[PDB]
Structure 1
C-alpha cells in the first residue's frame, strides 16, 4: 500500500532525527492545528473469538469487521448503514428497511454499540475536531503491549495497554496525534518534530509505531 510506505518514511525520518536528544525540546512549535484528524477510534471491542471487532469512531458512529471479512457501519442518525462485502463492494441501506439477510449482522453490531455505551469510556471525548469521507477498519491486530487499528482513509491508530497512551498517525497530513495518560490531546507534523524535537515519551512510542507499520506492510 502507498500510504503505509508513506508513513514508514515519515516515522523513520522522525526517529532518525532522535527528537528526544535535542539540546532543548521545542515540541510545542511542532503543533499543527490544520492537521487534527477528522476521525479516530474512541472505543473498541474484541469479540474476535466468535464475531469480530466492533469499534466506535469519534463521531458516535460504530462499525464491525466480522470474521467472514465483511464490514458494516452505523451512522450517528442511528439508522443509516453501509455494508462492505468481502471482495470490497460497498452498498447503502437503512436498518429500518429491515433487510432479512443482514438482521444478524445488524443485531451483532447493535450489541457492540449498546455495549460500548454502558461499559466503556470515550477516548478523546475532549479533542477539538478541526469535510471528508467516513472510513472503515481496513485491518487490525494486537500484540503484548498494544492494539493497532488501520483505517481506510490511510490512518493508523495505536492504543497501548499498560498506561492508556494512544497514537493517531495520518500519512496524508504526515502528522501524529499523541494522547498522554491525562487524556490531553496534541497534533504534530512529523517533520516539525524532526526540527523542534519532542519528549522521551512520544519519541519511544514513535519508535514503536514504526515497528507496527513494519508489521502491517509485512502482512499486506
Structure 2
C-alpha cells in the first residue's frame, strides 16, 4: 500500500498545487473518504517499554520494543497479540496465558496514563462505516510523529501547531486536521487539479519524504 501512496503523493506534489491560477481547495473535498481509524492519543515510552496509543474507537495498543504488539478492544476485555513475524492470536483479559501478564499490565499502564492525561484527537468526527488495525511501525522527528497502521494508513502529527495528516492509500485520499481542529478529507487527484493553500502543500511535501522513509525501512 505504501508504494501506492508514494505515487499518489508524488503526482500531487508535482502539480505545485499552491501555484494554481485560482486555488479551489474545497472542490477537492470528498466527505465519504473520511477514515474509519486514526490514532487519537500516543505515549512514547520507547526508552523503557515501547509506544502506547489509542485509536479513535477507544481501542488501545502497544508496539513493544521487542517489535511485538498487544491490542485491547474497546470492549475492555478482548486482546490480540501480534508477534514479531506477524503471527496473530486472540486472548482476553479474562482468559489469557501467564506469559503475557507483564505485557498486559504495561498496556493497562499505558491505558491509564492516556485516560488521565491526554486529549482524544478528532473526538468530534464520526468515522466512516473494518478490521481493527495495529501499529506496524512509527518514528519521531523533531517536528512530527509518523504512525503507520496495519490497514495501510499513515498518520503524521505535527508538534508545533497540532495539525495532523491522515493518509489512506486505499482511497487515494488525505484528511487534514488544522490548527482549529477542523477536519477536511480530500481526494488527492482533486487536490492535484484544484490546488491547495501553501500550508497544506508544505505538509504534503513533508509527507512524501516520510513515506519514502517508511518504504525504505522495510
- Structure 1 Cα separation of the partners of residues 182 and 100 of structure 2: 39
Q: CA-to-partner distance for each residue in 1:169-206, whole Å, 9 max, x for gaps? A: 01110000001011111100000001111111111000
1:178 aligns with 2:155: no
| Moved beyond 3 Å, runs of 4+ | none
Tell me how far 1:83 sits from its aligned partner: 0.4
Structure 2 residue matching 1:106: 3-state secondary structure: helix
Tell me how far 1:130 sits from its aligned partner: 2.3
- Structure 2 Cα separation of the partners of residues 190 and 214 of structure 1: 18
- Structure 2 Cα separation of the partners of residues 129 and 50 of structure 1: 33
Contact 1:33 1:130 (C-alpha < 8 Å) held by counterparts: no
Unaligned segments of structure 1, at least 5 residues:
none
Q: CA-to-partner distance for each residue in 1:35-63, whole Å, 9 max, x for gaps? A: 11000000000000010000000000000
- Structure 2 Cα separation of the partners of residues 204 and 62 of structure 1: 31
Contact 1:58 1:125 (C-alpha < 8 Å) held by counterparts: yes
Unaligned segments of structure 2, at least 5 residues:
none
* RMSD after superposition: 0.9
- Structure 2 Cα separation of the partners of residues 206 and 191 of structure 1: 13
Compared CA separation, residues 193 and 39, structure 1 to 2 (3 A): same
Tell me how far 1:98 sits from its aligned partner: 4.2
Q: CA-to-partner distance for each residue in 1:93-120, whole Å, 9 max, x for gaps? A: 1101142111111100011111110101
- Structure 1 Cα separation of the partners of residues 208 and 148 of structure 2: 13
Q: CA-to-partner distance for each residue in 1:125-156, whole Å, 9 max, x for gaps? A: 11132251110000000111111000110000
- Structure 2 Cα separation of the partners of residues 92 and 13 of structure 1: 40
Structure 1 residue matching 2:115: 3-state secondary structure: helix
Structure 1 residue matching 2:94: 3-state secondary structure: helix
**Number of positions where the alignment pairs a residue of Structure 1 with one of Structure 2:** 218
